[PDB]
């Protein structure tokens, strides 16, 4: 019985701005400062193509040298909540942010932090309701 996965519902395709090898800011308060993106979940690839992700996607990261020693040296799940590549919503609105940012989060759906700094996107809030709850602003 109940063992459900993380992403709640369907999501439309948006522009993917972050490919493997990118470094993004840590938006929660776990202790990490930068997150290095090494893989994307649900990704079927193609010859020579780099995996890529948008807001709401679950990615795999490693915590960089400016983050806490106990979090480093491991592969960790996260969700991207802020993006600089501009994208189009279905209602015809184009939108982008100033930085790239994500939070550390397991596929069951619980944060490893207690707060989120700055705004997040409707995409992340709608797929992850704990993000939708603990977020302070949603655009």
């Amino acid at each position: 019985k109940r063992g459900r996965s993380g992403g709640i519902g369907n999501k439309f395709r948006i522009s993917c701005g972050l490919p493997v090898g990118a470094v993004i800011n840590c938006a929660d308060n776990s202790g990490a400062k930068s997150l290095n993106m090494i893989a994307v979940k649900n990704w079927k690839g193609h010859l020579n193509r780099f995996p890529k992700a948008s807001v709401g996607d679950m990615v795999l990261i490693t915590v960089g040298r400016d983050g806490k020693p106990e979090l480093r040296r491991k592969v960790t799940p996260a969700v991207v909540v802020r993006q600089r590549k501009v994208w189009r919503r279905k209602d015809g609105v184009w939108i982008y942010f100033q930085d790239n940012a994500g939070v550390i989060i397991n596929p069951k759906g619980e944060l490893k932090g207690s707060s989120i700094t700055g705004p997040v996107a409707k995409e992340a809030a709608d797929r992850w309701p704990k993000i939708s709850t603990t977020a302070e602003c949603v655009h």
């Binding site: 439309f12 193609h46 010859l47 279905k90 209602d91 015809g92």
Partner: protein, 378 residues
């Protein structure tokens, strides 16, 4: 040896050869299938691509993430002045396919139709249908040849021409096209219907309906002689390749000792005959109506022609149809529109709340000239 990594081929070999079109215009290859007992209707019409805009619409899907929300959609405006029905053709289904019986023409023929018979009109001396008009002055002759079609032909089409003196276009001779009469109770009712249409005008609103689906046929934009990277979409080679990186590196093994037809090469790109399918009709209306593009949402009056005009097309002054999405060709090619042979099954209905009429010459921010002048008063 085997290719070490798996990767599909580039491009679709069912669109070969990539040669320039030889047909003159888009030509309707197939007509929708006749249903014994269906009410009578026409199936096809011919217009000219006029422009693009976008609309706001309230979505009434079901199970979708847009279920009770508003979406902004792209739409294409096609200009369709009424056509004139001038002849009737009948065919029969024979051990050798479709063979024609005879063609019956109208008693009196118009200038654009006469002009399509000639190369230069002012110079050529005019002896088209010279005996036909005299013979067929009395309508008995047309009655008997109609009698022959009724007696034995299996399909009926009418031969109708467009009318370019009602467009901004530059040509003066018409485009002539057959529209097949489908449906009815029998053949003879179709022949009667064709006789009743003979010599009259036909509007697109009496062929197509709002919310239905159509197929658009035209000839694509031309680009001339192009290399493989753009014509086929193959990968570009590394920077330090000696003589160019815009190529396929290997065009075949040693055996077989010939170049295969499946290898990408350079040549003519664009100007092909294509078919896009399942286009939903946003509206049919007219430009003489000054309320044509005005919704209950906004109080000012708007019509089809944008502030500044349709860029690179001209002014539309008659009937128009408006489909969701896109369609082949540049501005001003003639598009064939037919009913959709295999339509898509779950398309939510049409409910328009706003149509953009602002200027497409540049980035125009005014829905109408009157409010531009009010904004720039004094």
């Amino acid at each position: 040896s085997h290719r070490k990594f798996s990767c599909c081929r580039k491009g679709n070999l069912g669109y070969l050869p990539r040669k320039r079109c030889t047909r003159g215009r888009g030509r309707c290859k197939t007509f929708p299938p006749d249903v014994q007992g269906a009410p009578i209707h026409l199936t096809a019409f011919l217009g000219y691509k006029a422009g693009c805009t976008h609309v706001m619409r309230f979505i009434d899907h079901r199970g979708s993430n847009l279920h009770n929300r508003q979406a902004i959609d792209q739409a294409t405006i096609i200009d369709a002045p009424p056509m004139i029905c001038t002849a009737i053709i009948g065919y029969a289904k024979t051990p050798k396919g479709l063979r024609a019986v005879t063609t019956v023409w109208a008693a009196h023929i118009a200038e654009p139709a006469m002009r399509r018979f000639y190369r230069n009109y002012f110079h050529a001396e005019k002896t088209a249908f010279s005996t036909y008009m005299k013979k067929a002055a009395d309508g008995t002759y047309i009655k008997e040849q109609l009698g022959r079609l009724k007696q034995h032909a299996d399909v009926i089409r009418i031969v109708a021409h467009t009318q370019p003196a009602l467009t901004p276009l530059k040509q003066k001779k018409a485009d002539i096209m057959e529209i097949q009469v489908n449906g009815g109770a029998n053949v003879a009712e179709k022949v009667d219907y064709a006789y009743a249409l003979m010599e009259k005008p036909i509007s697109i609103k009496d062929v197509f309906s709002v919310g239905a689906q159509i197929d658009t046929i035209s000839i694509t934009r031309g680009r001339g002689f192009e290399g493989v990277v753009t014509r086929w979409g193959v990968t570009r080679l590394p920077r330090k390749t000696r003589r160019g990186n815009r190529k396929v590196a290997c065009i075949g093994a040693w055996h077989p000792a010939n170049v295969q037809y499946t290898v990408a090469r350079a040549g003519q790109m664009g100007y092909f005959h294509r078919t896009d399918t399942n286009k939903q009709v946003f509206m049919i209306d007219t430009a003489e109506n000054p309320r044509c593009c005005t919704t209950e949402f906004d109080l000012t009056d708007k019509s089809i022609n944008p502030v500044g005009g349709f860029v690179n097309y001209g002014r539309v002054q008659g009937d128009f149809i408006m489909i969701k999405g896109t369609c082949p060709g540049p501005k001003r090619r003639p598009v064939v529109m037919r009913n959709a042979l295999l339509p898509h099954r779950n398309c939510p209905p049409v409910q328009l709340q706003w149509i953009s009429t602002a200027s497409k010459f540049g980035h125009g921010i005014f829905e109408t000239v009157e409010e531009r002048r009010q904004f720039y008063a004094k």
